[PDB]
Design a protein around this motif. Sequence first.
Motif, PDB file in Angstrom:
ATOM      1  N   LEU A 195      45.695 -49.884 -40.622  1.00 35.37           N
ATOM      2  CA  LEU A 195      46.866 -49.242 -39.906  1.00 35.37           C
ATOM      3  C   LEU A 195      48.533 -48.970 -40.264  1.00 35.37           C
ATOM      4  O   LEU A 195      49.043 -47.995 -39.704  1.00 35.37           O
ATOM      5  N   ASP A 196      48.813 -49.973 -40.926  1.00 35.86           N
ATOM      6  CA  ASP A 196      50.178 -49.600 -41.515  1.00 35.86           C
ATOM      7  C   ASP A 196      50.469 -48.307 -41.977  1.00 35.86           C
ATOM      8  O   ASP A 196      50.111 -48.053 -42.971  1.00 35.86           O
ATOM      9  N   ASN A 197      51.485 -47.496 -41.571  1.00 34.10           N
ATOM     10  CA  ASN A 197      51.908 -46.298 -41.970  1.00 34.10           C
ATOM     11  C   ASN A 197      50.686 -45.265 -41.847  1.00 34.10           C
ATOM     12  O   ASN A 197      50.734 -44.366 -42.300  1.00 34.10           O
ATOM     13  N   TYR A 198      49.620 -45.587 -40.982  1.00 27.68           N
ATOM     14  CA  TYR A 198      48.551 -44.627 -40.811  1.00 27.68           C
ATOM     15  C   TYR A 198      49.097 -43.712 -40.000  1.00 27.68           C
ATOM     16  O   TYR A 198      49.752 -43.624 -39.064  1.00 27.68           O
ATOM     17  N   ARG A 199      49.054 -42.155 -40.807  1.00 26.91           N
ATOM     18  CA  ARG A 199      49.573 -41.094 -40.149  1.00 26.91           C
ATOM     19  C   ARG A 199      51.071 -41.023 -39.764  1.00 26.91           C
ATOM     20  O   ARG A 199      51.582 -40.575 -39.120  1.00 26.91           O
ATOM     21  N   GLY A 200      51.685 -41.987 -40.787  1.00 25.55           N
ATOM     22  CA  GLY A 200      53.318 -42.077 -40.642  1.00 25.55           C
ATOM     23  C   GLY A 200      53.743 -42.967 -39.642  1.00 25.55           C
ATOM     24  O   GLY A 200      54.729 -43.437 -39.524  1.00 25.55           O
ATOM     25  N   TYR A 201      52.814 -43.758 -39.104  1.00 27.28           N
ATOM     26  CA  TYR A 201      53.059 -44.737 -37.940  1.00 27.28           C
ATOM     27  C   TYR A 201      53.231 -46.261 -38.712  1.00 27.28           C
ATOM     28  O   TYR A 201      52.094 -46.792 -38.921  1.00 27.28           O
ATOM     29  N   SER A 202      54.344 -46.849 -38.495  1.00 23.41           N
ATOM     30  CA  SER A 202      54.428 -48.063 -39.199  1.00 23.41           C
ATOM     31  C   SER A 202      53.807 -49.297 -38.415  1.00 23.41           C
ATOM     32  O   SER A 202      53.453 -48.811 -37.078  1.00 23.41           O
ATOM     33  N   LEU A 203      53.256 -50.130 -38.921  1.00 23.30           N
ATOM     34  CA  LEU A 203      52.661 -51.563 -38.147  1.00 23.30           C
ATOM     35  C   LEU A 203      53.381 -51.960 -36.785  1.00 23.30           C
ATOM     36  O   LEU A 203      52.600 -52.246 -35.785  1.00 23.30           O
ATOM     37  N   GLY A 204      54.602 -51.983 -36.830  1.00 19.92           N
ATOM     38  CA  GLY A 204      55.394 -52.379 -35.651  1.00 19.92           C
ATOM     39  C   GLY A 204      54.837 -51.531 -34.411  1.00 19.92           C
ATOM     40  O   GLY A 204      54.990 -51.851 -33.317  1.00 19.92           O
ATOM     41  N   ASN A 205      54.543 -50.140 -34.787  1.00 24.91           N
ATOM     42  CA  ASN A 205      54.249 -49.183 -33.574  1.00 24.91           C
ATOM     43  C   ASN A 205      53.006 -49.673 -32.881  1.00 24.91           C
ATOM     44  O   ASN A 205      52.819 -49.595 -31.680  1.00 24.91           O
ATOM     45  N   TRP A 206      52.034 -50.208 -33.811  1.00 24.03           N
ATOM     46  CA  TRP A 206      50.569 -50.279 -33.406  1.00 24.03           C
ATOM     47  C   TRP A 206      50.643 -51.679 -32.756  1.00 24.03           C
ATOM     48  O   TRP A 206      49.939 -51.803 -31.790  1.00 24.03           O
ATOM     49  N   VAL A 207      51.446 -52.615 -33.196  1.00 23.73           N
ATOM     50  CA  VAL A 207      51.455 -53.965 -32.625  1.00 23.73           C
ATOM     51  C   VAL A 207      52.190 -53.818 -31.057  1.00 23.73           C
ATOM     52  O   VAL A 207      51.771 -54.482 -30.130  1.00 23.73           O
ATOM     53  N   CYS A 208      53.129 -52.965 -30.994  1.00 24.92           N
ATOM     54  CA  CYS A 208      53.907 -52.753 -29.804  1.00 24.92           C
ATOM     55  C   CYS A 208      52.922 -52.144 -28.781  1.00 24.92           C
ATOM     56  O   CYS A 208      53.233 -52.515 -27.767  1.00 24.92           O
ATOM     57  N   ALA A 209      52.295 -51.128 -29.155  1.00 21.35           N
ATOM     58  CA  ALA A 209      51.249 -50.403 -28.387  1.00 21.35           C
ATOM     59  C   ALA A 209      50.185 -51.255 -27.715  1.00 21.35           C
ATOM     60  O   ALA A 209      50.063 -51.323 -26.611  1.00 21.35           O
ATOM     61  N   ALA A 210      49.579 -52.279 -28.564  1.00 20.25           N
ATOM     62  CA  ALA A 210      48.773 -53.165 -28.134  1.00 20.25           C
ATOM     63  C   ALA A 210      49.213 -54.143 -27.060  1.00 20.25           C
ATOM     64  O   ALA A 210      48.572 -54.485 -26.225  1.00 20.25           O
ATOM     65  N   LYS A 211      50.469 -54.583 -27.376  1.00 25.41           N
ATOM     66  CA  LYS A 211      51.324 -55.414 -26.451  1.00 25.41           C
ATOM     67  C   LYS A 211      51.203 -55.017 -25.045  1.00 25.41           C
ATOM     68  O   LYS A 211      50.790 -55.638 -24.183  1.00 25.41           O
TER      69      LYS A 211
END
Length: 129
Positions: free
Chosen positions: A17-33
């Motif tokens: 997921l890190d930078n998948y489709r240009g979205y850094s890992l922080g984005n994914w962790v933030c969304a899950a939170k």
Amino acid sequence: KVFGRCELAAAMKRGGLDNYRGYSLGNWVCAAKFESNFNTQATNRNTDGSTDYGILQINSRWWCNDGRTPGSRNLCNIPCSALLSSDITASVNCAKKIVSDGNGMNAWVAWRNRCKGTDVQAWIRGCRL
């Protein structure tokens, strides 16, 4: 399973997921939170009768089959219950399809309202990645 911040970051990273489709890992962790509070077993019913499942709150109307959402498309070809597992692989693979669907991460309302345009780097700060 209730993931820890860094523990989740590592699993998502290993998941590609890190930078998948240009979205850094922080984005994914933030969304899950904000979507599930890092809880794989979270579910939430919507007014239209559909239900959101798991760590990333994936909707039954389009992505998974729960057997009680008329008109469901099951685009990820998987029972919604598989998204509640402690192994996040299914949620990760389905999320890749969702984010590639044309609207990017805006598909997740909590991301758009609480993560988008914020310093998402803070979500992985301190983690040994």
